[PDB]
Scaffold this active site. Structure first.
Site, PDB file in Angstrom:
ATOM      1  N   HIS A 156       0.831  -1.211   0.000  1.00 34.73           N
ATOM      2  CA  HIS A 156       0.000   0.000   0.000  1.00 34.73           C
ATOM      3  C   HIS A 156       0.870   1.269   0.000  1.00 34.73           C
ATOM      4  CE1 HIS A 156       0.887  -1.114   4.204  1.00 34.73           C
ATOM      5  NE2 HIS A 156       1.028   0.188   4.385  1.00 34.73           N
TER       6      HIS A 156
ATOM      7  N   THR B 202      -4.952   1.585  -0.078  1.00 37.24           N
ATOM      8  CA  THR B 202      -4.629   0.687  -1.185  1.00 37.24           C
ATOM      9  C   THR B 202      -5.503   1.152  -2.351  1.00 37.24           C
ATOM     10  OG1 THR B 202      -4.096  -1.222   0.207  1.00 37.24           O
ATOM     11  CG2 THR B 202      -4.705  -1.645  -2.115  1.00 37.24           C
TER      12      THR B 202
HETATM   13  C1  LIG Z   1      -3.498  -1.517   4.294  1.00 40.15           C
HETATM   14  C2  LIG Z   1      -4.632  -0.524   4.506  1.00 40.15           C
HETATM   15  C3  LIG Z   1      -5.332  -0.022   3.392  1.00 40.15           C
HETATM   16  C4  LIG Z   1      -6.398   0.928   3.551  1.00 40.15           C
HETATM   17  N1  LIG Z   1      -7.079   1.379   2.440  1.00 40.15           N
HETATM   18  C5  LIG Z   1      -8.106   2.266   2.558  1.00 40.15           C
HETATM   19  C6  LIG Z   1      -8.863   2.727   1.382  1.00 40.15           C
HETATM   20  O1  LIG Z   1      -8.600   2.377   0.255  1.00 40.15           O
HETATM   21  N2  LIG Z   1      -9.922   3.620   1.588  1.00 40.15           N
HETATM   22  C7  LIG Z   1     -10.263   4.112   2.884  1.00 40.15           C
HETATM   23  O2  LIG Z   1     -11.200   4.873   2.916  1.00 40.15           O
HETATM   24  N3  LIG Z   1      -9.558   3.715   3.968  1.00 40.15           N
HETATM   25  C8  LIG Z   1      -8.518   2.806   3.876  1.00 40.15           C
HETATM   26  N4  LIG Z   1      -7.814   2.337   4.964  1.00 40.15           N
HETATM   27  C9  LIG Z   1      -8.021   2.734   6.389  1.00 40.15           C
HETATM   28  C10 LIG Z   1      -7.808   4.222   6.528  1.00 40.15           C
HETATM   29  O3  LIG Z   1      -6.337   4.315   6.452  1.00 40.15           O
HETATM   30  C11 LIG Z   1      -7.822   4.902   7.868  1.00 40.15           C
HETATM   31  O4  LIG Z   1      -8.450   4.473   9.045  1.00 40.15           O
HETATM   32  C12 LIG Z   1      -8.714   6.098   7.345  1.00 40.15           C
HETATM   33  O5  LIG Z   1      -8.893   6.887   6.143  1.00 40.15           O
HETATM   34  C13 LIG Z   1      -9.056   6.787   8.643  1.00 40.15           C
HETATM   35  O6  LIG Z   1      -8.603   8.219   8.690  1.00 40.15           O
HETATM   36  P1  LIG Z   1      -9.151   9.453   9.271  1.00 40.15           P
HETATM   37  O7  LIG Z   1      -7.803  10.145   9.362  1.00 40.15           O
HETATM   38  O8  LIG Z   1     -10.039   9.968   8.325  1.00 40.15           O
HETATM   39  O9  LIG Z   1      -9.719   9.150  10.623  1.00 40.15           O
HETATM   40  P2  LIG Z   1      -9.129   9.364  12.144  1.00 40.15           P
HETATM   41  O10 LIG Z   1      -9.075  10.671  12.383  1.00 40.15           O
HETATM   42  O11 LIG Z   1      -8.069   8.335  12.161  1.00 40.15           O
HETATM   43  O12 LIG Z   1      -9.989   8.427  12.912  1.00 40.15           O
HETATM   44  C14 LIG Z   1     -11.288   8.521  13.526  1.00 40.15           C
HETATM   45  C15 LIG Z   1     -11.603   7.016  13.922  1.00 40.15           C
HETATM   46  O13 LIG Z   1     -12.884   7.208  14.681  1.00 40.15           O
HETATM   47  C16 LIG Z   1     -14.028   6.577  14.024  1.00 40.15           C
HETATM   48  N5  LIG Z   1     -14.931   7.636  13.502  1.00 40.15           N
HETATM   49  C17 LIG Z   1     -14.700   8.996  13.387  1.00 40.15           C
HETATM   50  N6  LIG Z   1     -15.681   9.711  12.869  1.00 40.15           N
HETATM   51  C18 LIG Z   1     -16.655   8.785  12.610  1.00 40.15           C
HETATM   52  C19 LIG Z   1     -18.008   8.920  11.999  1.00 40.15           C
HETATM   53  N7  LIG Z   1     -18.509  10.052  11.569  1.00 40.15           N
HETATM   54  N8  LIG Z   1     -18.745   7.742  11.873  1.00 40.15           N
HETATM   55  C20 LIG Z   1     -18.240   6.518  12.299  1.00 40.15           C
HETATM   56  N9  LIG Z   1     -17.006   6.304  12.865  1.00 40.15           N
HETATM   57  C21 LIG Z   1     -16.226   7.454  13.004  1.00 40.15           C
HETATM   58  C22 LIG Z   1     -13.419   5.604  13.042  1.00 40.15           C
HETATM   59  O14 LIG Z   1     -13.377   4.355  13.668  1.00 40.15           O
HETATM   60  C23 LIG Z   1     -11.985   6.131  12.670  1.00 40.15           C
HETATM   61  O15 LIG Z   1     -11.022   5.197  12.241  1.00 40.15           O
HETATM   62  C24 LIG Z   1      -6.739   1.371   4.892  1.00 40.15           C
HETATM   63  C25 LIG Z   1      -6.024   0.841   6.014  1.00 40.15           C
HETATM   64  C26 LIG Z   1      -4.987  -0.090   5.854  1.00 40.15           C
HETATM   65  C27 LIG Z   1      -4.344  -0.529   7.156  1.00 40.15           C
END
Ligand SMILES: Cc1cc2nc3c(=O)[nH]c(=O)nc-3n(C[C@H](O)[C@H](O)[C@H](O)COP(=O)(O)OP(=O)(O)OC[C@H]3O[C@@H](n4cnc5c(N)ncnc54)[C@H](O)[C@@H]3O)c2cc1C
Length: 272
Positions: free
Chosen positions: A49, A66
């Site tokens: 990724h 990814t």
């Molecule tokens: C190998 C790999 C590949 C990935 N590929 C992708 C991809 O292709 N597309 C993709 O979208 N993500 C993907 N992800 C996961 C993604 O990286 C992260 O968790 C993501 O985008 C979270 O980021 P954030 O910074 O937006 O949230 P942050 O600020 O990290 O996190 C807030 C956390 O609180 C929760 N949360 C917050 N607000 C809400 C809400 N309104 N409703 C419900 N729950 C909530 C969630 O559980 C979330 O993870 C991948 C992860 C891995 C490990």
């Protein structure tokens, strides 16, 4: 490096320009970024990724993704993303950092990409090269069946592997996917997955489970469990490898202990 790729060095950050965007649903999107030239390809091995990084609210933020595109694509890279909006969930008023930052970008804006990263690489025809840790050389193995457990956005690492297998008419590996989500509305990339099931049934088995089930539902309800593992993933054996990607709590409490009960050893399970 054999081809003209974008990710030449994993220690370098590459600012890519946002050139297109698609509204898939109220909270899902496709973001397309241009590569350095229309003739470039990304250069991302199957199983690995990239990371996006930027400064938000005065802090550096880094997250893995990814792409849904592949090295067959020239000039662009596509990401499918779930946006976690603020003041929408009582337990997370602030929403998600990186996903909201993407939703707020204007066409023409740039964002840093880096890669390829990850301890597992699919070399094709059932061969997997896996490193014990970042400081070891990979150990190669060949399997006949690949089990896959994805939760929410964890579906993209699975879809990338599924497509690589199916694209090769001579790859005999069979993929089994158990895809878990909070509700039917949250099933990401369902049309894409069902088109693959209809075209390649012999090498791709698909099953879903949701916490909140709709009245008309033909699949499973509930957290991933022992029964689902036995009925929708291949049996334990040297010829089987299980892949996982989803929220830490799901993997730690729903997946690992049930895989163990069923007989899948940890040396034959990998978490992205
Ligand atoms: C190998 C790999 C590949 C990935 N590929 C992708 C991809 O292709 N597309 C993709 O979208 N993500 C993907 N992800 C996961 C993604 O990286 C992260 O968790 C993501 O985008 C979270 O980021 P954030 O910074 O937006 O949230 P942050 O600020 O990290 O996190 C807030 C956390 O609180 C929760 N949360 C917050 N607000 C809400 C809400 N309104 N409703 C419900 N729950 C909530 C969630 O559980 C979330 O993870 C991948 C992860 C891995 C490990």
């Amino acid at each position: 490096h054999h081809h003209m790729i974008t990710l030449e060095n994993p220690d370098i950050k590459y600012p890519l320009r946002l050139i297109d965007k698609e509204i898939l649903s109220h909270d899902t999107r496709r973001f397309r970024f241009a590569l350095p030239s229309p003739q470039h390809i990304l250069g991302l091995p199957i199983g690995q990724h990239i990371y996006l990084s930027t400064r938000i609210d005065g802090n550096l933020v880094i997250r893995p993704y990814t792409p849904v595109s592949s090295d067959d694509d020239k000039g662009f890279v596509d990401l499918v993303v779930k946006v976690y909006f603020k003041e929408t969930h009582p337990k997370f008023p602030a929403g998600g950092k990186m996903s909201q930052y993407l939703e707020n970008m204007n066409i023409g804006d740039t964002i840093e990409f880096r890669g390829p990263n990850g301890l597992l690489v699919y070399q094709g025809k059932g061969k997997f090269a896996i490193r014990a840790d970042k400081k070891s050389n990979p150990v190669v193995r060949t399997v006949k069946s690949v089990g896959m457990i994805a939760g929410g956005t964890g579906i993209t690492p699975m879809l990338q592997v599924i497509r690589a297998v199916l694209k090769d008419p001579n790859d005999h590996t069979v993929c089994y996917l158990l895809f878990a989500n909070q509700s039917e509305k949250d099933i990401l990339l369902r049309p894409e997955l069902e088109e693959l099931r209809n075209e390649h049934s012999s090498r791709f088995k698909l099953w879903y489970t949701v916490d909140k089930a709709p009245d008309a539902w033909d699949y499973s309800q509930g957290f991933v469990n022992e029964e689902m593992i036995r009925d929708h993933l291949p049996p334990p054996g040297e010829e089987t490898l299980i892949l996982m990607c989803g929220p830490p709590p799901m993997i730690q409490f729903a997946c690992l202990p049930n895989l163990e009960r069923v007989g899948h050893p940890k040396e034959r399970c990998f978490t992205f």
